[PDB]
Write a protein that binds this DNA or RNA. Structure first.
Ligand SMILES: [Mg+2]
Ligand SMILES: [Mg+2]
Ligand SMILES: [Mg+2]
Ligand SMILES: [Mg+2]
Length: 50
RNA sequence: GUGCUCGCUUCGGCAGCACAUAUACUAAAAUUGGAACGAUACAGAGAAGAUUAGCAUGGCCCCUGCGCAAGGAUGACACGCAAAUUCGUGAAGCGUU
């Protein structure tokens, strides 16, 4: 019954599931780089990026 | 530069005439930028359970190939809270002309 519910719920394949996780990881690394850049601008250190 | 001048006129010089008439992306440089795999960590291969052949499609994505062949993971990407013009009924409660 548990496998029945878990397979009646699913519609997504491999690539959609890796892209959703990749979007969450991109959001996480964006917030992390945002925090680092906000600290570098808050204390004041003008390191430029590429 | 050379030759000819019944040129001065010596073998020294000068004069005249003739022929000959415009190289070089100008550097042995100074500069200026974008770039070599590939190593560093991470990262993991589509199709509604799982294991999988693939053929396409589109373009500010390319690589290998002489290729209008064929490969590159079906080469990669594409996965979207997929909302575009324009509304009306019926009673019910409350306030108003
Ligand atoms: Mg599958
Ligand atoms: Mg092919
Ligand atoms: Mg395959
Ligand atoms: Mg293809």
């Amino acid at each position: 019954l548990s496998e029945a519910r878990a397979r009646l719920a699913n519609t997504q394949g491999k690539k959609a599931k890796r892209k959703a996780r990749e979007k969450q990881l991109e959001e996480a690394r964006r917030l992390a780089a945002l925090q680092k850049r906000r600290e570098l601008r808050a204390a004041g250190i003008e390191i430029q990026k590429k």
